[PDB]
Amino acid sequence: THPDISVDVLVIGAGPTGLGAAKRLNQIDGPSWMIVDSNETPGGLASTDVTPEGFLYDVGGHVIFSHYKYFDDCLDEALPKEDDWYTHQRISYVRCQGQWVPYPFQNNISMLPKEEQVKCIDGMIDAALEARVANTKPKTFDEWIVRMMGTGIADLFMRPYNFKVWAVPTTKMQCAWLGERVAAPNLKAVTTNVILGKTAGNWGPNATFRFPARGGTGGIWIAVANTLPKEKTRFGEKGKVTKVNANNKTVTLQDGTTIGYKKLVSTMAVDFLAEAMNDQELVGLTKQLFYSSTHVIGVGVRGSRPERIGDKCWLYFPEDNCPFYRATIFSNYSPYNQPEASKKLPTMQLADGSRPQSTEAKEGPYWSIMLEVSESSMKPVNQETILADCIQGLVNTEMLKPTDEIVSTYHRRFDHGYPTPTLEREGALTQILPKLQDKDIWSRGRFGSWRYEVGNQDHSFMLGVEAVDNIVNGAVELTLNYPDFVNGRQNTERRLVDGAQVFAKSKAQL
Amino acid sequence: THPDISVDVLVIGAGPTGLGAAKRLNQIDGPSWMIVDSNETPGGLASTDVTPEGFLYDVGGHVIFSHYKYFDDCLDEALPKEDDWYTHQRISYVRCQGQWVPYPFQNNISMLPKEEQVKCIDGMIDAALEARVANTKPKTFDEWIVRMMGTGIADLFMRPYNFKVWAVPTTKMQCAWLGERVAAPNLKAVTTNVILGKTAGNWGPNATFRFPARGGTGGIWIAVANTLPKEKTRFGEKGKVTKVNANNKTVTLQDGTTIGYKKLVSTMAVDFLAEAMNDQELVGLTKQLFYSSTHVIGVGVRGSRPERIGDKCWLYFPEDNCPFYRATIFSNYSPYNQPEASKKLPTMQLADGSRPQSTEAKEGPYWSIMLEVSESSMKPVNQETILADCIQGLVNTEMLKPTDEIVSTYHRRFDHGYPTPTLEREGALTQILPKLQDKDIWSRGRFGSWRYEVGNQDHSFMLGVEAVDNIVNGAVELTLNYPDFVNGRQNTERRLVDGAQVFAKSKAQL
Amino acid sequence: THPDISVDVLVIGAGPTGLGAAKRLNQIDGPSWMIVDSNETPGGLASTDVTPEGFLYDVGGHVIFSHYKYFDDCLDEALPKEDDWYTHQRISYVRCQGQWVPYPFQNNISMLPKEEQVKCIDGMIDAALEARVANTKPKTFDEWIVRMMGTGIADLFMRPYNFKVWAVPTTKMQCAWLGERVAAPNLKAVTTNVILGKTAGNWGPNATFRFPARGGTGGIWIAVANTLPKEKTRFGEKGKVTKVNANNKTVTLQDGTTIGYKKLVSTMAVDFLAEAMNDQELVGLTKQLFYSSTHVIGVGVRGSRPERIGDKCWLYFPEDNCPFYRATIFSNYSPYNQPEASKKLPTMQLADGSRPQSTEAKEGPYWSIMLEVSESSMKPVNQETILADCIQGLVNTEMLKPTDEIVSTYHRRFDHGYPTPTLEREGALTQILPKLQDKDIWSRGRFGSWRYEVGNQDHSFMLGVEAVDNIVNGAVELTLNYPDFVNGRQNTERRLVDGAQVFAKSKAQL
Amino acid sequence: THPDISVDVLVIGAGPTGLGAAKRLNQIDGPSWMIVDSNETPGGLASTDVTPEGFLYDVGGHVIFSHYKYFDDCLDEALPKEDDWYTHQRISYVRCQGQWVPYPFQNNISMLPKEEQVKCIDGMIDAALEARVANTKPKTFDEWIVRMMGTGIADLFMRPYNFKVWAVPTTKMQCAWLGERVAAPNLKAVTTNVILGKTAGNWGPNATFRFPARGGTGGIWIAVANTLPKEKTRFGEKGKVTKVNANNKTVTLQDGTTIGYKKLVSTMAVDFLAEAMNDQELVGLTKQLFYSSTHVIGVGVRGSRPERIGDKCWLYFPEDNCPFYRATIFSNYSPYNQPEASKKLPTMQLADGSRPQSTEAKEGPYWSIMLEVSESSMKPVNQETILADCIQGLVNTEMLKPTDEIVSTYHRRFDHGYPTPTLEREGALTQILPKLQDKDIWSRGRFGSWRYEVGNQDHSFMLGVEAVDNIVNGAVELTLNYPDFVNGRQNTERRLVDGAQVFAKSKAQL
Ligand SMILES: [Cl-]
Ligand SMILES: [Cl-]
Ligand SMILES: [Cl-]
Ligand SMILES: [Cl-]
Ligand SMILES: [Cl-]
Secondary structure, X not given: OOOOXXXXXEEEOOOHXXXXXXXXXXXXXXXXXXXXXXXXXXXXXXXXXXXXXXXEEEOOOOOOOOOXXXXXXXXXXXXXXXXXXXXXXXXXXXXXXXXXXXXXXHHOHHHOOHHXXXXXXXXXXXXXHHHOOOOOOOXXXXXXXXHHHHHHHHHHHHHHHHHHHXXXXXXXXXXXXXXXXXXXXXXXXXXXXXXXXXXXXXXXXXXXXXXXXXOOHHHHHXXXXXXXXXXXXXXXXXXXXXXXXXXXXXXXXXXXXXXXXXXXXEOOOHHHHHHHHOOHHHHHHHOOOOXXXXXXXXXXEEOOOOOOOOOOOEEEOOOOOOOOOEXXXXXXXXXXXXXXXXXXXXXXXXXXXXXOOOOOOEOOOEEEEEEEEEEEOOEOOOHHHHHHHHHHHHHHOOOOOOOOEEEEEEEEEEEEEEEOOEOOHHHHHHHHHHHXXXXXXXXXOOOXXXXXXXXXXXXXXXXXXXXXXXXXXXOOOHHHHXXXXXXXXXXXXXXXXXXXXXXXXXXXXX | OOOOEEEEEEEEOOOHHHHHHHHHHHHHOOOXXXXXXXXXXXXHHXXXXXXXXXXXXXXXXXXXOOOEHHHHHHHHHHOOOHHHEEEEEOOEEEEEOOEEEEOOHHHOHHHOOHHHHHHHHHHHHHHHHHHOOOOOOOOOHHHHHHHHHXXXXXXXXXXXXHHHHHOOOHHHEOXXXXXXXXXXXXXXXXXXXXXXXXXXXXOOOOOEEEEEOOOOOHHHHHHHHHOOOHHHEEEOHHHOEEEEEOOOOEEEEOOOOEEEEEEEEEOOOHHHHHHHHOOHHHHHHHOOOOEEEEEEEEEEEEOOOOOOXXXXXXXXXXXXXXXXXXXXXHHHOOHHHOOOOOOOEEOOEEOOOOOOOOOOEEOOOEEEEEXXXXXXXXXXXXXXXXXXXXHXXXXXXXXXXXXXXXXXXXXXXXXXXXXXXXXXXHHHHHHHXXXXXXXXXXEOOOOOOOOHHHOOHHHHHHHHHHHHHHHHHOOOOHHHHOHHHHHOOOEOOOOOOOHHHHHHHHHHHO | OOOOEEEEEEEEOOOHHXXXXXXXXXXXXXXXXXXXXXXXXXXXXHOEEEOOOOOEEEOOOOOOOOOEHHHHHHHHHHOOOHHHEEEEEOOEEEEEOOEEEEOOHHHOHHHOOHHHHHHHHHHHHHHHHHHOOOOOOOOOHHHHHHHHHHHHHHHHXXXXXXXXXXXXXXXXXXXXXXXXXXOOOOHHHHHHHHHHOOOOOOOOOOOEEEEEOOOHHHHHHHHHHHOOOHHHXXXXXXXXXXXXXXXXXXXXXXXXXXEEEEEEXXXXXHHHHHHHHOOHHHHHHHOOOOEEEEEEXXXXXXXXXXXXXOOOOEEEOOOOOOOOOEEEOHHHOOHHHOOOOOOOEOOOEXXXXXXXXXXXXXXXXXXEEEEEEEEEOXXXXXXXXXXXXXXXXXHHOOOOOOOOEEEEEEEEEEEEEEEOOEOOHHHHHHHHHHHHHOOOEEEOOOOOOOOHHHOOHHHHHHHHHHHHHHHHHOOOXXXXXXXXXXXXXXXXXOOOOOHHHHHHHHHHHO | OOOOEXXXXXXXXXXXXXXXXXXXXXXXXXXXXXXXXXXXXXXXXXXXXXXXXXXXXXXXXXXXXXXXXXXXXXXXHHOXXXXXXXXXXXXXXXXXXXXXXXXXXXXXXXXXXXXXXXXXXXXXXXXXXHHOOOOOOOOOHHHHHHHHHHHHHHHHHHXXXXXXXXXXXXXXXXXXXHOOOOOOOOHHHHHHHHHHOOOOOOOOOOXXXXXXXXXXXXXXXXXXXXXXXXXXXXXXXXXOEEEEEOOOOXXXXXXXXXXXXXXXXXXXXXXXXXXXXXXXXXXXHHOOOOEEEEEXXXXXXXOOOOOOOOOOOEEEOOOOOOOOXXXXXXXXXXXXXXXXXXXXXXXXXXXXXXXXXXXXXXXXXXXXXXXXXXXXXXXXXXXXXXXXHXXXXXXXXXXXXXXXXXXXXXXXXXXXXEEOOEOOHHHHHHHXXXXXXXXOEEXXXXXXXXXHHHOOHHHHHHHHHHHHXXXXXXXXXXXXXXXXXXXXXOXXXXXXXOHHHHHHHHHOOO
């Protein structure tokens, strides 16, 4: 019995990974293909939301750094106009003992209190000496931290912060993922800065970045998707997958529709995929994986951007005076992430949690703060108090004065927020993924393949691109299996226009 | 003024690298292409000669170990029959002080004289203690050797042997090339074997290998070339490139024929290429490279295979009692590498150099020995004596009895034999290659790109495949730039039939 | 009330330590002095017993190596005749798995079975690598052993043997005592000998030694004692100390005699001394010390010296097939340690424990074996079976054939045999000794000061000499407080005739 | 032919070493002895001079830290009255870049400029990392310095200062001598101090010291000499040795007197001694030694003690703005080192070298500065200028205002000042000293035995004491051969009243 639809390559999910697949499928223009998503708006976790008050919020505050020229190509194609983008410098700090320590923390001990400087420089001297002699490798994230930074910085920042964000102890995570995530501090340079009182916040791929002028980051993915042939997309309730029959290569949609595929690129969470397959073995396997949920909190506030806030981009909060691990001055990325000054809005509450002296709609201007709070079986959070707790936290960290007027609030919980690089992860993935591929199913993405090291938007996008390129041109999936390889190089070879398309164009013009 | 011929991609050279380009160009079947070679017979350095007496000789005794499924696919296509191949186990030894030390030498100290064992175990102990503390990297091949094996093994085997093959002292070479070439010995394992008297000759990719039943390895490349559209090839005097005009992208052949190209894949020696471009800058750059010439000496001998020879495949000769660094019992690979026993041949001489007691043509059977002797500006060789010196060497090493009857002899000198991994190499290549690429010229191959670590038949074949794959599909050239990456994995993704071809075939079906 | 006798310096005990004290007191001939001992025969633990059958036995088999010229002087004086001494070369072995391994064990791995050689060479490699990097110090004897020899040699010899002798686990002992006792094996030299099959039994002060022709080592001390003025000695029941009144410096003897002293040199076991002082605090401190008792077993056997025995001097037994840790072929030291061949003796029993076939007194010649067995609260021994058990052990270790005729037997238990270098030792001694000295009591000797590293006869002799030299001439007690100092040098300065006596002699000549 | 005088032991030189010998010869009161010196006043280099203006100057500013109770006893005997001594605390600083860095320099990096702190903390970090792994020993003082402090502190202080004092480059000196002279800095402690801004100037034996109320240190040795039997001393021109006839053990004095000896304790510089012996071999040997001369400069200045000067005791000057390596505020040690306030003196010059506005004799009070300048074949110094140069330096280092009134000046050059611990030293001494002893000559003292490690007054005194003790009581000369042993312990055994004298006294009481 024939399926309602038959394609060579079926793409499930229209987030960055899925759209990457679609883009390369569309570029090659060889096999037939189709992309579906239960959401009417493509973008997935890289989408932007809006409060009724006109405040925009990305899903946690997303800053792009591109490792791939291909990813750049597709962005330039979607938002080609110069004024589609703003370019910014990374102003990042960590909140430690009343003071803002420039990112990364481990490289800026100099901004700490004297007593704390001691504990830190001590830990590093120890670690540098043991390292001069070490011949074994760190078994856990935690060991790596101690080995690389010493007990001083471990206890002061690394350990408490990482629990606050991963929702699992540092001793429960693996060490291989953090090539380009965590900076290994040089003893000599660190003490030199302590002596001099200088800073060093240039480490990391976040140096300088682009942000879309309108629509938040979610705008990019809407623009990218628009380059696809509408009839090959199926977004909304009509595109919600409810069943995957690996054995006879057919997917079933919510509305009963059936799609037949030769090859399946799934970008939904691999545990949901296992469920949708009714494959008991895979379900059990995926159940060995671990993830944290993410609460994204949005706070719209009236007033000119306080000088105390300055041009800070994102801030890290290791201390326990606030529930959130990171905050972003989202209003700094684009003036279109919040209403214009002329827009009149009533004050909902003051930062201290009290009623405003006036509930009349007043003018702005406005600024915006975006928060993230992790959740897991090891770190539960109370949904009905988290917004209030977050706002208090903003007070406690002197992000807001208790008098500051709050004009808009945003709170949304994303079940699958972070794929946790646990000690167990690979043992599971090295079974799950191979077994899926033996069924002609490329499971890829932040939760498709579950590898955070390679879980950024560009990474995800390329996972989709490279899956297709593997399916069609026999390309090695570098991003999936070799995070350090792709992350350590400039990937310039693959382009939105490869030789193939050039030669075909010229043969058609004769 | 139009050229006689115009193709999208022109391939110069039909050795493995060139043919690799061809097979993928021919597979993709997109851009137009053409392949030329000055030799009527494709195969390059991987081809086979035959003496008038019917004894075959490869260019030094070639053994195939594949790192790529794609390579395997093309061999299977060209020689699909089970009985087209022989599969063998590596029986390799090193000749040291009257005894046969199993390969690798450094892993079998137990087979040496007691006095020599001491010198070696001592060396390793020292090295192992300094390694426990070392934090810098070796600057030369020689340092690497000392660090990894100790002075004992360095002076006994490594140092003398490597000069005898590379034709340059170990102190003039770089350390980066030897990932899978030189075995780093483990002190405990080595001494445990010395105590017990056990061996360990399983290290290396050569464990089990296959070899063509007929025509030598050259038979493979003739077969592979036959799967190409004949009309797209131009082999022989008609295909000899004499001039390359990079500025207007046209090549000129010996017979005056002009060929225009959009992309050039050049597999000739990059120094010859620079010469053919009349590009002074590149000629100067290429002259900073270094290579050794290779003398291949063949000796056909009458008699049943001596038990003293046994099933030995190839043998290493570090000592100075013979000029050759290696010997291959070529007759062991295939019964068709030498005449049948029923064939009658006259004896040309005895191993000791004297005349045969009888110049009548007697029967066999026969066995065959193939020698290699290196030459360079640092190690000259006398061509008119080398054959004789080699035969004497065979006597001194007890490979031949002074009474053994020589039936056939072979000697040929190949100017460009080994691309020497000198210290200066990369300094030159990282200038030569990029500058060539800016002219849309992909120089690839054993001398096309000059990197030995990736200079085997499968490496070369792939260098060509990947050059095309980069030109057409924007694939990254992994084999060229990341030897250790391609050598350390199973490269299974690229196939002689990719999804592209499958999907196009099914689209033409309906 | 005046005491019966009053001397300036009183010496309790006429072992080597006491005799040393006396000899220098007598040389200086300044302060008045006196030496007492409960034994009619001076010598203490360095005395010799005789069986009724005419078989001599030292208290464990004593071999002199002199660190002091002073010690040499007194022996030359006591036994000045050339033929008073025999000179020997140390032939020492360790009984391991049916074989005799030359001393020291850790230096002769070559003589072990192959399977065991591997275990050992492995341990040493591990330890050599850890050592290359170690920066801390060993906390226990055990740790020291591992660090210096590896787990292989530790489990095979060091750990089992050291318990067998010290009667306490190697984990319970300190590491500082073994400067010149335990050899630290060099990895390269060891493996070099395993490869070649050579030996290395020259390590240690025991190389070549001299032994008294007559009266066992006990003869020496009788002779030394005879050079003292008889009226200044009091040996026997008349010289047994029963009370020490530190407060009014008066000693009381068994026969009621009281002796007044200004300075006391006590060479009795320091725990006995505290008891004799009725000093509760010191008693409590001394009880923190630990010692092992020694069983000395003597076996006289009929027959020419078996060739299997050869010229072996002393032998170490780490295995558990015999209760003794060491055996000495005491008959080898001097022909006068056992009866002449012409002497007729009845056989008491056979080595297998059976009755002899003849109980008539037959002739010799004879040889003699001396054994040692340790006892402690951690290692009890059954006195009534130990002799039989020892004789069986001599059979199991093939020291005796079950047929060998045993002519004489000897067994005596010395309560204070070895002062155990426990972890707790120095904590107690650094209180005990100074507190005793504050009372003008120099407690010195193998059990007077309780320090094994400095507990040989010469050491003890010199402890007494230096004690007196401190009392009279303000000399620093080097042997007591700096074992490594005196052991690591040639002590040539102090002589039996110092300038003092030379100048006095010359002033009396005028 | 008999000598005019005959003694058992003859002592040449009445500095601290000679007087040490005499004191013990006098205590023992056994052999006959006699001490001679070419100076009417005993003290040697530890004697005091006086300027006509009434200003005292030690030979460089001598500060006593006693390692020996014996030394203490003799000083208590010579100067028994409480008010014979002043007790002080070590206030010591190093002059670096306009600031006073508390001694030791290496432990107080915090007091440096920020740019310099970096250079130093960097060097230590490097050093600490190499030390974690080092397994060889330093071949020179310089290497020791680098290894122990880093190139930072090496270039800033150690290297320049040590040449400025030793008159030789740090690379020309040996490493063994500096157990208690140079402090090995702990990285963690140093950086902790840099961070906190704290100090640490307690390291060293100089913590708290005592100084003779009257007569400078010279008063001590005058008082000590006075305790000797006058008739056994021969000081002055009458005591000047001119010949030493080692072969018939007779010494010849200036006035022709001949002294026969049995043992000779020579404290004159061993080079002069070899000369006096007319022993060619020893002359050659002694010429292999090296020494630096010492210029002592004394500056008396009118005025109350400037607050700028404070209670500083001695100060180190590594920088090249002054010729002197050390300065002492001698006036701070005792009020009797300079005239009383009431004394009237004319101003000789101003600190700037100009004439005084008034040559009338005005009152005080006064203060005194003592400087030291080194000289050698590698570092000449111009005698006629040095005084002025030194005064200028005092100006440059802001020790003196150019207006300060200089009342008195002192300058004297001591040919033998410092025995240089050169690399060659021991190779010479280990021949010189033993060869001398085979002749019954004990050469001892700062230049008698030439070892600086053990060349302070107490060390010297004891070298003499121990020499006599070796001659008479067969005592080991610990201070001569084991500097580290004596320096690292409290030497409490040898006293001015030993048991010997006590017992002899009580024997004569009966
Ligand atoms: Cl070529
Ligand atoms: Cl006792
Ligand atoms: Cl019998
Ligand atoms: Cl002198
Ligand atoms: Cl004036």
